[PDB]
Each structure stands twice: as structure tokens, then as C-alpha cells.
Amino acid sequence: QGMMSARGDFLNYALSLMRSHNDEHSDVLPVLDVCSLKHVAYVFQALIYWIKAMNQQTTL
Amino acid sequence: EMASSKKKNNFIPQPIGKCKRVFQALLPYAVEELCNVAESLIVPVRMGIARPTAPFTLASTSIDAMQGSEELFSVEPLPPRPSSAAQAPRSMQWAVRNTQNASSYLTSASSLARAYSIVIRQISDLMGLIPKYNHLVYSQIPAAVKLTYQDAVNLQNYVEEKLIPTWNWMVSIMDSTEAQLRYGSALASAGDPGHPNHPLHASQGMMSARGDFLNYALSLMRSHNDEHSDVLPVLDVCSLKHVAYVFQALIYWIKAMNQQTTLETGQNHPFFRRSDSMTFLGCIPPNPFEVPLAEAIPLADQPHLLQPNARKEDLFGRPNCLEVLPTKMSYAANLKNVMNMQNRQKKESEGPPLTSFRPQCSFMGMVISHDMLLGRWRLSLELFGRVFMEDVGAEPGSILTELGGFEVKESKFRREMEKLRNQQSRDLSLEVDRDRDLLIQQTMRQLNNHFGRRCATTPMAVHRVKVTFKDEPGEGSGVARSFYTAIAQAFLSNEKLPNLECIQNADDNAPLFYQPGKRGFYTPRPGKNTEARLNCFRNIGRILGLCLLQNELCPITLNRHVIKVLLGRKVNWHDFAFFDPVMYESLRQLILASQSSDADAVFSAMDLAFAIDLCKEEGGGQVELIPNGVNIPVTPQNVYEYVRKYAEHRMLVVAEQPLHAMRKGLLDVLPKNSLEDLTAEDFRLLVNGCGEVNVQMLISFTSFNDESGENAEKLLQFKRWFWSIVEKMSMTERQDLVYFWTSSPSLPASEEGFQPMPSITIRPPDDQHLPTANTCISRLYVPLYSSKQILKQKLLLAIKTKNFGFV
Amino acid sequence: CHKGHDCKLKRTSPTAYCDCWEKCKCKTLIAGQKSARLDLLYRLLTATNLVTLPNSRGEHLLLFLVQTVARQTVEHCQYRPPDMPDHDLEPPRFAQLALERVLQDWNALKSMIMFGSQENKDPLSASSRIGHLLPEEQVYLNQQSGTIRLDCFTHCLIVKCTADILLLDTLLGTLVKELQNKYTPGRREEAIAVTMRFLRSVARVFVILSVEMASSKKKNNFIPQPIGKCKRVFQALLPYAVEELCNVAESLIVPVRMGIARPTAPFTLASTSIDAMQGSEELFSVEPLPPRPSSAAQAPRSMQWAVRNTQNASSYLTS
């Protein structure tokens, strides 16, 4: 199942990407994996920290 | 899903061909939609978003690809709730983390880049169809959307607008990589190789990972401000697979645009122009009359310097947004600079028909041509062309293939030889003596009886060449291997020939070949230009062709211009350096003299005329370069005519009939088309092998057998002794050694050149006996000598004793 | 005592005394008059430009002195009160006084910070011979500047001077004083250039140290000196430190944001400051390349579909 599962997942990912571009994804779950988002999660915390510090400066 | 065929085929399976048909019928709209698809495909890669995935194989057959798609299209909507890698050079090895199922980001990024390149190629093709659209619609599709010149303009603008973002990203990366590589090269040459941190010197888990990461961060921080003068940049090319795919696709776009745009005594005369292999990528050649021969053509200085894996830069001498060099290593600076230049530049059919559409790449820079880019990212390209050749280079329309070395060209040539060899079931059989005179006469007579009883206007395709020696009844290919060398050595000898007129039944005894200049390399000797001699020469050409077809070497050390004649291509001034280096330099000085204010006085004082004295090996006497040349003086203005005719005369006219005969002889066996992809260097490596006996090359292909019964450690010590002795041998002695071992002085140009592999058998200890070799199987036998000195003396004596024993 | 002789650092255990006094004509047995030594130091510093010169290994006097002061700190902490020379004498403090005094000279500090710059080209062991190279290599290799010795000096000043702060305060006070020298023409821009180069070196030190040291889940004010001193530098040079740190952040994010970053194997963060500092030693103990010699809690079911999980080799995601 390995090779065919990898191929199927990749092709389904491409299909989902092409559909989502034009909002043509009404009857299928978007292909998504959060384990890949670790680096953006780090960046996201830092960026919120910047804006939160700005708001603290406004309230302080 | 469908794997690209390495062989060019027009199969174009219906599942894809029909998609192309749709796009062609709806071109003006299909292009825009495909651009949006390309955007969606690239964004996951360019932004670092794409999901990790496990690898998968591409489907070779259309059937399996279609079946794989079935599992993707056999889907029902969700119902509602019911009611209830070639090795890098040492100067760049530091840049590669390599030894030269689970999911991974790089796998997905690379496969997504592949999909992106597919879409980009489709877009480039659709744009390529515009000029012929008014013809390719009616001849292909019953109906299609009409489009006009104005629409073609807008399509070009739209496509490039969608591609520029990706282009800027790619350029930043490529420029940084090229800067780091050029920096590493400059630092490697400037620094001391003895130092342990030197790139050529280099060429725990947790702490190693931590150290590497911290060093990477350090390098990044330093490169941002050009504070990286004494350390190698931290770089890994294995991570650049996805950008390599994208890069090929983007070059393809610009190259298609350029294709759409394209779709005497002067130094400008074709004879003086740099030739095959000599013209570097988007580099401007150094004028050959300003650079001494020793430096202009290092290969001409050392004719044995050519190697199958030699860098083109070494052999032929080291060499607008793109005219500005990629000097920054920091990425960020490169993108900002790209954007600054780009912002400077940025700030029925009416009228013309589509056939008059003049598209171009006129943005990002004013004019781009791919040679400029191949020159810009020259080092990045050279490294990619070895790391990614098996992956990115396998793509259709691959640009890495232009970086292919000898092995690539040899692969294609071998395929042609296999196709030709398997078409005939009639072999060649030669029965010859070992005596030089008898060998020549017998070989040539039998070759004429073989050739003339077959159609003389068709190539002599055969399955196997088998040779037997008189009183030495070995048989088959091994004997043919020893025979090719024996006959080649018979040709190259300075001894007088037997009467070649004996060959006609199937005195001009001048040797067949001679050494011009101060080289040990040969040019055909015309002798008396009798028909018997030319007959011999034609048969020699046949031998060359047969050896190529049989994947065997023919060690006839011919000069480069001779090889060009055999290949069916023109000989140039630059090839005269390979005929006679001394005369090349002297004639070059004569050309430089023609540029002096006293040039007239110099040419008159030298008493030069368009007639040249020939040495005995050239037939002797004085021969005119041009009719009435004796009475025609050489002047500073016709100096190029004089040098051109001098070089051409000695390279071609003196031996024109021998060369013509040899050319036909090669064509008598192999088709001309098979030679079109080869340069003189490739023909040399295929026919003559490696003139320089690279000891490491010989080692890597050698296997060792033991008949002594001794322990492996003692045998290892002895093996090391042998190879050390070989390394210390002079080139003559190395050639004699390989000749002793295999009956051929040259090494094959590749691993596939050995059939079977060479081997050395270690015999029981004996300090009196000499080594012996069964050359028909490339097997050398060496006694287990008690000392290295004995092995050296005995081995040298055995190899220099050309009177080989009948082992 | 062995100047110009064949001497090599031995690999045996460091727990040993020195045999030079007994086996040779040791010329370092006599301390001399310390006050005269210091007075002569001051006179030479103001009388000559010798302070700007490197030694035979290309090392600037400040680098020499900083390493010497840290080393003496280690050796002298082992001292104890009480034909053979007099022993149990008080160790010298000359190296520390010299380091403090040299750092007060704008010329010495400028030469050290600008050391490795295109203008302040190191003549020895630092790619000093370029003219023999073809133009391409000259253009590329002349464009970069070296900071190995500036980085090692800054690293020593911050990480190895664990028993001092006045040295860093002296350096920073000098930079501030010259940055405030609005009344001197040209000098202002020079002070800024020097300060920016120094800040970039400090930022490199800061990033390395901060990445290695593990963040404590318990809120602590330990703020180890290796990082606290970097923060002190930034605070003293805030208006410039901010800009330089922004550029550092840019260089750190670009490899990630563009999908460029190299794959790397994972590593553990150091819990103690000591191990982080030691890890940095392997990164800062570097010599320049010499020239060629002359010859996861479970997701809810409605979102589990979005996670590829069950709820050393290098990898891109790790990096």
C-alpha cells in the first residue's frame, strides 16, 4: 500500500490545492497537515508578541 | 503520474493529448487558467507551506497512470445529515551534504516543482503556438477560439505578471548560491591547502547537529553584511532540488521567448574561429593571438591531459540586471537588488497578423538570452549538472544535459553501436602473425576480402570480431583486443614497411605514420601516394570503426585534426596546435609581427613565401601552399592566408589522400550520423582511451585473485606495494605496464569500457621469475615478491620486454 | 624564555608545575618594578602607534590581552598565600590593567573593531596576497571582510570574562562618547561605522547563546551573564542595536520564509549556562584560513483530519 498510498495522497493534495484556488471545494475536506506548520507557529507567536507589546504600550 | 520517456517519442498518450487539445481549442482562456493553476502549485513550495509526503514512483505505462487517477476521480459528494548524483569537484564538494515510507518536506517540494514545471512547459507551448495559430487550428481542431495580435500581447504580459514573483524568488536564491560557490573557489585558490579548514583539505551526534546548526546561523549572519572573508559559506545543495526544478522551467520560458524572436584574411574567417568544446558558455573567448599556446590551450600543451571526467575549464583554459554579477551571498540583498533594478524598468485580427507576432522577454531586464544566465549561474549549473543530473536532469527539455560530460555522449554513442551491432549476424575473422610485416600484410588482405565480398557502399555492421594468431591459436574477443594494439603499433613504428602492393590482391615502404613537431603523437605519412598505400589506409579506418562497434580500444595515437577528418568536420587553426605546438607558436608570433609598425620589413627580412619545406616523414621536398606559391611573398596583410594555408597544408594536404581513405574506412563500418554528437575529444576517448594512465582509474576497476594461500593482510601489503610502484612509473612506463597487462597501453574511458574487468592474480612467492599476463582476459600474474624493490625491478623489466612470452 | 624555539602545546593533564626555572636559563623569574612597568606602558601607548599593530600571528593587541586576562583569571584563582627561586609570590595584574587601558584608546579600539576590514587589511595569515590571482577571484575575494578575530574577541569579552564587567562598560562608554562627538567632523560617521560593526559581532554572539540556552519553564531572573551582557550592549546602543537586530531577524527568517533553509539534524537545548557556553567555544575557537605559501495533545474529531500524527538524520522541518 506504501507506494500507491504516497501517490494517492500527493495527487489528492494537488487536487485539493487546485480546487481551493477557485472556491470549488464544497463537498470534500481540504487536504491539510498541521505537523508541517511548526515553524510558522513559532513565527506566529513572535509576531503576536510584537503587536501585543504595542498594545501594552498603548495601555501603559 | 506519467513518467517522461528518456527516448524522444510522439506517443503523447490520449489522456494528456486530449487535455492539450482542449487547451489549444480554448487557448486564450486556457493560458490564463493554467497560469492560475501554476500559481497554486508554486505557492506551497515558494512559501514553505507544502505538506510533507512520502515518495512514489512515476508510472511508466499510461495504463497504470490512468488507474491511479481512477482512485482519485471515483469519488462521491458527502451527503447531508438525514432528517430525524555524480560526484562534485573538490572545490565544490564542501557545498553538498552527501556521500560523494516516511514523509518529508523536500519530497513534496520537489514533486510540486515537477508539477509546476509541467504547467509552465504547457504555457510556453501554448504561447509558442500563437504565431502559427491561424494554421494549426484548422489543420488540428474543428473549432477553436479566435485570438488577435493585441490578445497575444496581453497574454504575454499576463503570463509574465503571474510568473515574475516566482522569478524574483528563484533569482535571489540562485544568485546567493553562485556567489557562495565563486567565493569558495577564490578562497580555495588563495588559501593554503595544507590548512585543515581549507576546502580542498576537507575534500558526536547531538553535538554535531548543534554545531552545524549554530555554524549555519553564524554564516547567515555574516553573509548579510559581507563579513565572510575567511570562512567557507555554510551551504547544502541537496536542499535545492525543488528550486532546481523551478529553475529549469523558468529558463525554459525565457528560452522559448528567445526562440520566438529567432524563429578573407580576417580573424573572422572560419579557420581562425574557436571550435567545438573551446567556446565557453556566454563567455567571450580570450583572443588566441594574445594568449600563448601554453596558456590558451592547456590540452594542447599536454595532449594526454584529457580525461573522461576532466573539467572543460582546465582543458581549454579558465575564463542589465544580469550583466551585474551575483556578488552577494545573503539572499535578502539579492532579492532587494533584483527588485530595485526591476522597479527602474517597471516605472480576423486588426492590423498585424499573428504570424507577425514578435514576443520577447523584455522585463526584469531589457533583453535576456539564456547564454547570459548560463554564464551568470555557471558554477551553480556545473554543480547541479552532477548532483541533480539523475533527477532534475532527467526532465523533458532538461537544461542540465547541456552540462553532460564524456559519459553522457558515450551513453548515446553506445546505444547507437548496440542498435547497429545487433542488426547483423555475420562476424569478422582474421588470422594473422605477430611479426610486424606479416601482420600488416595479412590483416589488410583479409580485410579487403571481407569488405569486397560484402556491399562496399553499406557499413560493415558485424556482431563480433574474432581474431586468431598463427601458431598461437587463441580465439575470440581477447585475441582481437591484443590484435588491435599489435596492428596499431605496427602502424606507428618508424621501421620500413613491407610492400603494400601485396594488399591489392584481395616500393612505397615508407612508414604509415610519423610524429610531427615535438609530440609522440602521429599524423599519416603520405609516402609515394600509391593506390596500395591508400588501400591500407582505408582498411585502417575500417579497423577504427570495428573497434568502436565492438566497444574495444584501438591505440593509434592520432592527432586531433586527423580525428576531426574522421568525424567528418572541419579543421581549424586551433587544431594546428595539436599537429605541431612549436610551429603553432612561431606562426602565432608571425601574426603578432604583422601588427608591428615594421611588419613590412620583418616579413621581407624573413624571406617568407607561400611555399614550405617538408621533412622526410612528410614526403620531403618543397611543396607550394598555393599555385605559384614559390613566387608569391608572404606579407603582413596576407599573413593569415599564409598561416592558414601552412596549417591546412601540413594537417590535410600533405596527407589528404591517406586522410580521405581513413575517413571512408571509418564510414565503411559506421554510419556518419553516429559521429555527429562526438567531438575530437570524445572520439579520442572512445578510440584511443586515456593517453594518460590514470592509476586510480585502473585501480578502481581491478579485482585481485589469490593463488598463494597467504593471509589477507600480507596480500594487502603486497597490493599496496604494486600500486605505489605503478604511481611512480613514468608515463612511458605506465603505458608499457598497461600494455603488458592488457595488450593495450591506453585505459578505457569508462567502467563500461572493460569487458570483462581487469584483474591481478598473486602467485606464490618467487623472487627469480618475472610477472606474466594473459592479456586476452586482461589478467596479470605477479609473484608474491619478498620485497618492494624486487617487485619494482621485475615488473619494469617484464613490461619493457615487449618480447612477451607465450603465456 | 623559549621565544623562537620549537614549542608545542602538550596534551597531558594540565595539573603540573613549570620546569623552565630548573632546566633552563629562565628569564621570567624576575618581576621587576611593577610601577615602572605600568608607567612605561602608559608612556608607550600615548607616545607611539604601536598599539595598532598585530603580532607575528596577526593577532591584535586587544585580542592578545583579552585572552591573556581570561587565562590569568583561571590560573591566578589557584594561588594561595603561604638555588630555588622565591615562590608563593603574588601574581601579576599587568595584563588586566593593560586591557583596561588599551580599551580607552579610540585608535586601539577602532583598529580592533575595523580589523579584517578592507581598509584594515591583515597582512599575515589572512588572504593578504591577492595580486597574483586572476581578476574574477580578486573582485570576489576582496569584497568580503573578516570578523573571526572580532567575533572571538567579543566572545571572550562576554563569555569568558565571567569575573568582570568593567571591560565591557569601558568599550561601550568609548563607543557612546565617540557617537556623541557631534562637534568633530567625520569622526561622527566613523564612530557610527565602528559601532555598527561591533553591534553585528555582539548580535552574532547573542543569537548563538540565546538559541543554545534552554528557556526555563519556571520564571527565573537568572538571566545568565552571556546573554545579559548582550542585552546590556543593546540597551547602551539601543537606537542602533534595534536596526542591526532587525537585519539579523531578516537574515534568520528569509531561509525559512523562502524555503531555502538547509536540513539539519535535531539537537537538545542546553539546560545549564555552562554547557551552552562550551558549545559556543567550538564555534568561536576558529582561526582564519591562511594564504597559499610562497614557493502533542490529541485533536478533537472535527479537526483530527487536519493532523498527520498518531493522535540522527537531517530534515527541513527541524531546521
XYZ file of N, CA, C and O in Angstrom, chain C residues 79-156:
312
model
N 46.018 30.446 43.163
C 47.094 30.898 44.033
C 46.630 30.910 45.482
O 45.479 31.243 45.778
N 47.538 30.551 46.389
C 47.237 30.572 47.809
C 48.358 31.257 48.581
O 49.537 31.090 48.248
N 48.022 32.032 49.609
C 49.055 32.609 50.477
C 49.853 31.518 51.168
O 49.387 30.375 51.284
N 51.069 31.832 51.647
C 51.916 30.870 52.361
C 51.463 30.639 53.799
O 51.264 31.611 54.528
N 69.253 27.813 45.816
C 69.262 27.896 44.361
C 67.848 28.061 43.805
O 67.671 28.429 42.644
N 66.840 27.788 44.640
C 65.462 27.805 44.167
C 64.918 29.235 44.151
O 65.128 29.990 45.105
N 64.225 29.634 43.083
C 63.606 30.965 43.055
C 62.561 31.130 44.150
O 61.980 30.163 44.648
N 62.317 32.388 44.518
C 61.288 32.697 45.503
C 59.915 32.335 44.950
O 59.540 32.769 43.857
N 59.163 31.547 45.711
C 57.838 31.092 45.319
C 56.779 31.732 46.213
O 57.081 32.491 47.138
N 55.517 31.418 45.918
C 54.373 31.929 46.676
C 54.258 33.448 46.591
O 53.730 34.092 47.501
N 54.743 34.037 45.501
C 54.635 35.474 45.311
C 53.281 35.824 44.699
O 52.602 34.982 44.105
N 52.886 37.082 44.855
C 51.569 37.499 44.386
C 51.554 37.567 42.861
O 52.480 38.127 42.262
N 50.538 37.014 42.202
C 50.502 37.025 40.734
C 50.440 38.435 40.176
O 50.055 39.383 40.877
N 50.804 38.607 38.907
C 50.717 39.923 38.268
C 49.299 40.261 37.837
O 48.500 39.389 37.485
N 48.994 41.560 37.861
C 47.745 42.090 37.328
C 47.978 42.986 36.116
O 47.082 43.737 35.720
N 49.168 42.913 35.515
C 49.512 43.837 34.440
C 48.634 43.625 33.215
O 48.252 44.591 32.549
N 48.329 42.371 32.878
C 47.527 42.116 31.685
C 46.148 42.751 31.803
O 45.633 43.321 30.834
N 45.542 42.682 32.990
C 44.217 43.265 33.174
C 44.269 44.787 33.096
O 43.421 45.413 32.448
N 45.261 45.397 33.750
C 45.424 46.845 33.665
C 45.660 47.281 32.226
O 45.122 48.301 31.780
N 46.464 46.518 31.488
C 46.762 46.857 30.102
C 45.518 46.741 29.235
O 45.275 47.591 28.370
N 44.718 45.698 29.449
C 43.481 45.559 28.691
C 42.543 46.723 28.976
O 41.951 47.301 28.057
N 42.399 47.087 30.253
C 41.532 48.209 30.599
C 42.035 49.506 29.977
O 41.241 50.314 29.480
N 43.351 49.722 29.991
C 43.902 50.974 29.483
C 43.841 51.032 27.961
O 43.492 52.071 27.389
N 44.179 49.930 27.288
C 44.165 49.924 25.827
C 42.755 50.173 25.307
O 42.561 50.866 24.300
N 41.748 49.615 25.983
C 40.367 49.806 25.557
C 39.925 51.260 25.659
O 38.901 51.625 25.072
N 40.664 52.093 26.389
C 40.333 53.508 26.494
C 40.862 54.324 25.323
O 40.514 55.503 25.204
N 41.686 53.730 24.464
C 42.236 54.423 23.307
C 41.331 54.176 22.107
O 41.151 53.029 21.683
N 40.763 55.254 21.560
C 39.895 55.112 20.396
C 40.625 54.477 19.226
O 40.010 53.764 18.431
N 41.925 54.731 19.089
C 42.657 54.168 17.961
C 42.808 52.660 18.102
O 42.586 51.919 17.139
N 43.175 52.186 19.292
C 43.284 50.748 19.509
C 41.944 50.064 19.264
O 41.864 49.052 18.555
N 40.873 50.626 19.828
C 39.558 50.012 19.696
C 39.074 50.046 18.251
O 38.507 49.065 17.759
N 39.277 51.168 17.561
C 38.892 51.260 16.158
C 39.658 50.246 15.324
O 39.076 49.531 14.499
N 40.975 50.175 15.520
C 41.784 49.233 14.761
C 41.313 47.807 14.992
O 41.266 47.002 14.054
N 40.946 47.474 16.231
C 40.495 46.115 16.512
C 39.127 45.846 15.891
O 38.925 44.814 15.240
N 38.172 46.759 16.083
C 36.838 46.553 15.528
C 36.891 46.533 14.009
O 36.285 45.670 13.362
N 37.607 47.482 13.412
C 37.761 47.516 11.965
C 38.775 46.498 11.466
O 38.989 46.405 10.253
N 39.397 45.736 12.363
C 40.356 44.727 11.942
C 39.671 43.703 11.048
O 38.562 43.245 11.335
N 40.341 43.341 9.958
C 39.760 42.480 8.955
C 38.961 43.211 7.902
O 38.530 42.585 6.925
N 38.747 44.512 8.071
C 38.076 45.314 7.064
C 38.977 45.483 5.844
O 40.192 45.271 5.900
N 38.362 45.869 4.724
C 39.134 46.095 3.506
C 40.228 47.128 3.738
O 41.343 46.991 3.222
N 39.926 48.172 4.511
C 40.930 49.185 4.815
C 41.993 48.632 5.754
O 43.195 48.749 5.486
N 41.570 48.026 6.861
C 42.492 47.473 7.850
C 42.832 46.022 7.500
O 42.543 45.082 8.239
N 43.465 45.857 6.341
C 43.775 44.525 5.839
C 44.870 43.883 6.683
O 45.947 44.459 6.867
N 44.594 42.689 7.188
C 45.576 41.958 7.980
C 46.667 41.420 7.061
O 46.370 40.625 6.159
N 47.931 41.811 7.252
C 48.980 41.403 6.304
C 49.358 39.936 6.383
O 49.945 39.419 5.425
N 49.051 39.249 7.480
C 49.585 37.920 7.736
C 48.461 36.940 8.030
O 47.536 37.247 8.789
N 48.552 35.757 7.421
C 47.629 34.656 7.687
C 46.176 35.050 7.437
O 45.267 34.553 8.106
N 45.936 35.935 6.475
C 44.594 36.455 6.242
C 44.413 36.844 4.774
O 44.051 37.970 4.441
N 44.648 35.891 3.873
C 44.472 36.102 2.435
C 45.000 37.471 2.013
O 44.333 38.242 1.320
N 46.221 37.775 2.453
C 46.791 39.095 2.221
C 47.398 39.246 0.833
O 47.604 40.379 0.385
N 47.683 38.144 0.144
C 48.233 38.180 -1.206
C 47.119 37.867 -2.197
O 46.564 36.763 -2.186
N 46.800 38.838 -3.052
C 45.672 38.732 -3.971
C 46.119 39.056 -5.391
O 45.529 38.571 -6.364
N 47.162 39.879 -5.521
C 47.556 40.386 -6.826
C 47.892 39.313 -7.841
O 47.783 39.558 -9.047
N 48.303 38.129 -7.386
C 48.646 37.047 -8.299
C 47.425 36.301 -8.817
O 47.565 35.462 -9.714
N 46.242 36.580 -8.281
C 45.018 35.917 -8.701
C 44.422 36.634 -9.905
O 44.575 37.847 -10.069
N 43.735 35.869 -10.749
C 43.074 36.460 -11.896
C 41.935 37.372 -11.436
O 41.405 37.215 -10.335
N 41.541 38.334 -12.277
C 40.639 39.406 -11.811
C 39.342 38.932 -11.171
O 38.868 39.558 -10.215
N 38.739 37.860 -11.687
C 37.479 37.371 -11.131
C 37.620 37.094 -9.637
O 36.817 37.565 -8.809
N 38.662 36.345 -9.274
C 38.887 35.995 -7.880
C 39.226 37.220 -7.046
O 38.826 37.303 -5.881
N 39.954 38.179 -7.621
C 40.250 39.407 -6.892
C 38.967 40.147 -6.545
O 38.780 40.595 -5.408
N 38.067 40.284 -7.520
C 36.837 41.031 -7.285
C 36.002 40.354 -6.210
O 35.480 41.016 -5.303
N 35.854 39.030 -6.288
C 35.006 38.365 -5.299
C 35.645 38.368 -3.915
O 35.001 38.734 -2.925
N 36.914 37.972 -3.823
C 37.540 37.785 -2.521
C 37.893 39.100 -1.837
O 37.999 39.131 -0.606
N 38.075 40.182 -2.595
C 38.316 41.489 -1.999
C 37.048 42.136 -1.464
O 37.140 43.115 -0.716
N 35.876 41.618 -1.827
C 34.623 42.238 -1.416
C 34.280 41.921 0.033
O 33.700 42.763 0.728
N 34.622 40.725 0.500
C 34.290 40.316 1.853
C 35.296 40.884 2.847
O 36.416 41.264 2.495
N 34.877 40.938 4.109
C 35.743 41.327 5.208
C 35.665 40.265 6.296
O 34.685 39.525 6.401
N 36.718 40.193 7.101
C 36.822 39.199 8.150
C 36.391 39.742 9.498
O 36.595 40.913 9.809
N 35.780 38.867 10.300
C 35.392 39.200 11.665
C 35.770 38.105 12.652
O 35.378 38.184 13.822
N 36.517 37.085 12.216
C 36.834 35.966 13.099
C 37.453 36.472 14.390
O 37.081 36.045 15.487
N 38.428 37.372 14.278
C 39.094 37.861 15.477
C 38.215 38.831 16.245
O 38.233 38.829 17.477
N 37.421 39.643 15.549
C 36.451 40.472 16.252
C 35.417 39.607 16.957
O 35.036 39.888 18.099
N 34.959 38.541 16.299
C 33.987 37.652 16.926
C 34.592 36.936 18.123
O 33.946 36.811 19.165
N 35.832 36.466 17.996
C 36.485 35.782 19.105
C 36.743 36.741 20.259
O 36.573 36.375 21.425
N 37.138 37.976 19.952
C 37.369 38.975 20.988
C 36.076 39.321 21.712
O 36.039 39.378 22.944
N 35.007 39.582 20.957
C 33.721 39.880 21.573
C 33.227 38.691 22.387
O 32.712 38.856 23.501
N 33.390 37.482 21.848
C 33.004 36.281 22.571
C 33.765 36.169 23.879
O 33.189 35.832 24.911
N 35.073 36.403 23.849
C 35.845 36.343 25.083
C 35.357 37.402 26.060
O 35.069 37.106 27.224
